[PDB]
Amino acid sequence: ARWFPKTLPCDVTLDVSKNHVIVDCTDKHLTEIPGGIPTNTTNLTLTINHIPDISPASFHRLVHLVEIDFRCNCVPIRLGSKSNMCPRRLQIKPRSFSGLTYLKSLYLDGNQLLEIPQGLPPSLQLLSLEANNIFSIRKEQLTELANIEILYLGQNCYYRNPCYVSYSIEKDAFLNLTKLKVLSLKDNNVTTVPTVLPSTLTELYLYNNMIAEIQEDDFNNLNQLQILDLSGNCPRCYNAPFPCTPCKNNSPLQIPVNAFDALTELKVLRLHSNSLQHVPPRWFKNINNLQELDLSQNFLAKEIGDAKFLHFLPNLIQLDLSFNFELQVYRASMNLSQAFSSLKSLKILRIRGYVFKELKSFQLSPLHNLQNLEVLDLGTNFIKIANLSMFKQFKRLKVIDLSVNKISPLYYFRYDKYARSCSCYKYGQTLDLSKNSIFFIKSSDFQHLSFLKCLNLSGNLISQTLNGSEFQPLAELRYLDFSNNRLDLLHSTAFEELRKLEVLDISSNSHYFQSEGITHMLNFTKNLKVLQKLMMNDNDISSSTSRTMESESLRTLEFRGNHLDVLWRDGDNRYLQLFKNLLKLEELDISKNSLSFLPSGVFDGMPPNLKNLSLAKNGLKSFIWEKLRYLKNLETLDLSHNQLTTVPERLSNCSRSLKNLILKNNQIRSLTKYFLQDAFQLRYLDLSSNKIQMIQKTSFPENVLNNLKMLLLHHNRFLCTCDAVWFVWWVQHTEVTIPYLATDVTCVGPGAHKGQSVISLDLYTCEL
């Protein structure tokens, strides 16, 4: 019971520990900075709005501001919305920030600014001006930034935001920024490394530029540098999904052998897409502490078979040599140099896109005694042959990734993976064979792999009648992803040899379920004694040879994207107890099953401990709410995206345990007279995207409403007449969380009130 309603269209959080008062106005369709922002505001976010200008009046009384995030109020045309394009660039008048003596962070990215804003306070530590039109850096324009530590200037001149000229940086522009630690000049059309840079730099990003050559002294004074990224300078442009201009004569980025001598603290070196043909060992002479090295998207296929530089990297943790294939060559094998054995600290090795026909055990011998190796990624290599038993010498690994290959019996190609916008590994040893050509499996294929905990066979070509003998050696397996295959459940003994199986995914195996009159033994679960979760989504199941699925252990069943409407055809009672004997089942997802109605017997046929039931996206037109009495343990009921027109007369007379009721996206036009009357257990109600006009106190008693963790009412058809007097007052003065109050909890009428938020509604004429 608030005494003064909050009409400000921003979320106001109070973090009393750090004295911070956070005002978040992100994406509120604002054309001006709203009035009434708290005077003690420390963090103000006005991101994704259409405020055309900043002036001394903008933050006049907000003297305690430590951060202003004013991003994307005039986003460049190619990066922004075409339905609501920005007409003019953001105008910043003088003395807008100079009075803010506590300002530490200022983000003005994506506003089409032509110059670095001046009159900034001396307390500023972070300045961000990405995706603007600033492509000439002058020393006089950086004088104000004396105490700056982090400076983002990238994305001011590239294909999604062109400047039509080379980027210019005056000599020693950044040299006297004595506290500068992070400098990013990525995606800027830069032609040379700016010199002299301040020796305090810890991170330097110069990737996706036009730097053809590094001078031997470009990084001579950067003895504190930890991260250096020169990627995308002389890029490898074959199959580039973005406009890509390589260096002439197919030349690499020219780096002198002594260019990194001063970088004794370097931990990360990124040389992705630099068209490199050799990696001279001399580069890493003085770099002893290097931990991450990205050499992907170069022409290093031959170098991988020699790689003498690896002898100088005993502390390297991560090495990436992906997409170094030679065009038009299909190598018979992967030639890894013996030098890989000197990478004592290596945890992750990635060599995708090398392109070779057959993987043999001895080709991985240089990796055999790398004691800290955790990930070996050889995906996207068009490997046709691989004896999986070779991985018996790789039991210590966490993931063996052979995904996207031809084995049978956006990251590397995105322009800027760090661009700013406006899984079974946890089970243990994983062998990922997903998106391969395995059409048939036999026990001998998995010999010597009894240590595996997860096997991903998703997206293979397996059209087999499994009988419980195919995975016999996989005694420790806990997770089997068999999705996107053609499983034929002729035998109820399928998967029974996987005695420790906890999760089975057989989703998207619709092939044999789509053809009429063939056997489907859905009772196969009875033999899996420790199975906790079963997924059989998108199988188009409309028939079954077994009338009951049984399990003493299963807790979760996902059965979405099937045809329970056909199995439960009215007059056919045979499958109304299909899930009844899944005695420990707690979660059942039967959404997207074309259930326009539920026959009588479905609720009585549910297993006894059912907690979360989803009947979403079914086209449900009616629902006998009283039948929820059968589900004595129901806590969550999802009826979203259906065609329901009513709520129960008494929700308490339907379920004594229901905590979360989701009714969003239905056709509800009104609530029953005593809907939530005495439903004291309800903690979450979603009635959003319905057609409710009125809500009276009898339907929504305050003794129930105040207990709610959340109440969603947005996108309804609220009629703001004098009959809505209680609802409007309650919404304005309630502590109960209701999202979208200042953006989509609106009056649709009458007249004057059409389109008006109920939070700003004044109904004084109703009490004269």
Ligand X SMILES: *[C@@H]1O[C@H](CO)[C@@H](O[C@@H]2O[C@H](CO)[C@@H](O[C@@H]3O[C@H](CO)[C@@H](O)[C@H](O)[C@@H]3O)[C@H](O)[C@H]2NC(C)=O)[C@H](O)[C@H]1NC(C)=O
Ligand Y SMILES: *[C@@H]1O[C@H](CO)[C@@H](O[C@@H]2O[C@H](CO)[C@@H](O)[C@H](O)[C@H]2NC(C)=O)[C@H](O)[C@H]1NC(C)=O
Ligand Z SMILES: CCCCNc1nc(N)nc2cn(Cc3ccc(CNC4CCC4)cc3OC)nc12
Q: State the residues that interact with ligand Z by CB under 6 A.
A: 325, 328-330, 353, 355, 380, 382, 465, 488, 490, 512, 517-519
User: 63-92 mask for ligand Y (x: CB under 6 A)?
Assistant: ---xx-------------------------
User: 164-203 mask for ligand Y (x: CB under 6 A)?
Assistant: xxx----------------------x--------------
- Residue 159 is a binding residue for ligand Y (CB under 6 A): yes
Among residues 12, 163, 240, 375, which is the contact residue for ligand Y, using CB under 6 A? 163
> What is the spatial distance between Cα 30 and Cα 20, in angstroms, rounded to a whole number?
24
> What is the spatial distance between Cα 456 and Cα 242, in angstroms, rounded to a whole number?
32
Q: How far is CA 566 from the centre of its chain?
A: 36
- Whole-number minimum distance, CB 728 to ligand X, in Å? 54
Among residues 387, 437, 657, 667, which is the contact residue for ligand NAG, using CB under 6 A? 387
In the list a second copy, ligand NAG, ligand X, none, the entry touching 755 (Cβ below 5 to 8 angstroms by class) is none
Structural contact between residues 468 and 493, judged by C-beta atoms closer than 8 angstroms: yes
> What is the spatial distance between Cα 627 and Cα 433, in angstroms, rounded to a whole number?
45
In the list ligand NAG, a second copy, ligand X, none, the entry touching 164 (Cβ below 5 to 8 angstroms by class) is ligand X
Beta-carbon contacts of 44 under 8 Å, excluding residues fewer than 6 positions away, are 23, 25, 37, 59, 62, 65, 67, 68, 69
Residues 332-371, interacting with ligand NAG (CB under 6 A): 335
- Whole-number minimum distance, CB 636 to ligand NAG, in Å? 4
Total number of residues shown for the chain: 768
- Whole-number minimum distance, CB 655 to a second copy, in Å? 21
Q: Within 13 Å, how many C-alpha atoms sit on residue 617's CB side?
A: 10
User: 637-676 mask for ligand NAG (x: CB under 6 A)?
Assistant: ----------------x------x----------------
Using CB atoms, what's the residue nearest to ligand X?
A: 162
Among residues 233, 492, 640, 732, which is the contact residue for ligand NAG, using CB under 6 A? 492
- Whole-number minimum distance, CB 103 to ligand Y, in Å? 9
User: 161-200 mask for a second copy (x: CB under 8 A)?
Assistant: xx--------------------------------------
Residue 350: φ, ψ to 5°: -120, 125
- Whole-number minimum distance, CB 552 to a second copy, in Å? 27
Residues 32-61, interacting with ligand Y (CB under 6 A): 42-43
In the list a second copy, ligand NAG, ligand Y, none, the entry touching 306 (Cβ below 5 to 8 angstroms by class) is ligand NAG
Structural contact between residues 664 and 689, judged by C-beta atoms closer than 8 angstroms: yes
Task: Specify the DSSP element, H or E, that contains 730.
Answer: helix 725-733
- Whole-number minimum distance, CB 75 to ligand X, in Å? 17
Q: Which residue has the tokens 């057959």?
A: 358
Residue 124: count other Cβ atoms within 10 Å of its Cβ.
21
Nearer Cβ to ligand Z (219/323):
323
3-state secondary structure 113-148: CCCCCCCCCCCCCEEECCCCCCCEECHHHHHHHCCC
- Whole-number minimum distance, CB 491 to ligand Z, in Å? 8
Complete DSSP assignment for 504-544: EE-TT--TTTSSTT----GGGGGG-TT--EEE-TT------
Structural contact between residues 737 and 710, judged by C-beta atoms closer than 8 angstroms: yes
Nearer Cβ to ligand Z (283/512):
512
> What is the spatial distance between Cα 763 and Cα 24, in angstroms, rounded to a whole number?
28
- Residue 540 is a binding residue for ligand NAG (CB under 6 A): no
Nearer Cβ to a second copy (491/499):
491
- Residue 586 is a binding residue for ligand NAG (CB under 6 A): yes
The overall longest dimension of the chain from CA atoms, in Å, is: 92
- Whole-number minimum distance, CB 307 to ligand NAG, in Å? 8
- Whole-number minimum distance, CB 566 to ligand Y, in Å? 20
Residue 28: count other Cβ atoms within 10 Å of its Cβ.
17
43-79 residues labelled b (16+ CB within 10 A) or e (exposed)? bbbbbbbebebbeeebbeebebbbbbbbbbbbbbeee
> What is the spatial distance between Cα 745 and Cα 761, in angstroms, rounded to a whole number?
11
Count interface residues toward ligand NAG (CB under 6 A): 38
Query: For residue 646, what are its two tokens?
Result: 């009513």
Please name every residue paired with 712 in a beta bridge, in sequence order, or none if there are none.
Answer: 686
In the list a second copy, ligand Y, ligand X, none, the entry touching 435 (Cβ below 5 to 8 angstroms by class) is a second copy
Nearer Cβ to ligand Z (244/490):
490
Nearer Cβ to ligand NAG (97/524):
524
- Residue 461 is a binding residue for a second copy (CB under 8 A): yes
- Whole-number minimum distance, CB 243 to ligand X, in Å? 8
User: 143-172 mask for ligand X (x: CB under 6 A)?
Assistant: --------------xxx--xxxxx------
> What is the spatial distance between Cα 352 and Cα 569, in angstroms, rounded to a whole number?
50
- Residue 20 is a binding residue for ligand Y (CB under 6 A): yes
> What is the spatial distance between Cα 422 and Cα 47, in angstroms, rounded to a whole number?
7
Nearer Cβ to ligand Y (192/672):
192
Nearer Cβ to ligand NAG (6/580):
580
> What is the spatial distance between Cα 768 and Cα 59, in angstroms, rounded to a whole number?
39
CA neighbor of 329 nearest in space, from 354, 306, 351, 358: 354
Structural contact between residues 5 and 733, judged by C-beta atoms closer than 8 angstroms: yes
Complete DSSP assignment for 261-323: TT-TT--EEE--SS--S---GGGGSS--S--EEE--SSS-HHHHTT-GGGGG-TT--EEE--S
User: 115-154 mask for ligand Y (x: CB under 6 A)?
Assistant: ----------xx----------------------------
What is the contact surface with ligand NAG in residues (CB under 6 A)?
302, 305-306, 335, 387, 389, 392, 403, 423-424, 434-435, 448, 456, 458-459, 467, 469, 479, 481, 492, 521, 523, 526-527, 545-546, 586-587, 589, 611-612, 614, 626, 629, 636, 653, 660
What is the contact surface with a second copy in residues (CB under 8 A)?
77-79, 81-83, 159-162, 239, 241-243, 323, 353, 380, 404, 406, 408, 410-413, 435, 437, 439, 459, 461, 463, 511, 515-519, 542-543, 545, 566, 569-574, 596-597, 621-622, 643, 645
What is the contact surface with ligand X in residues (CB under 6 A)?
157-159, 162-166, 189
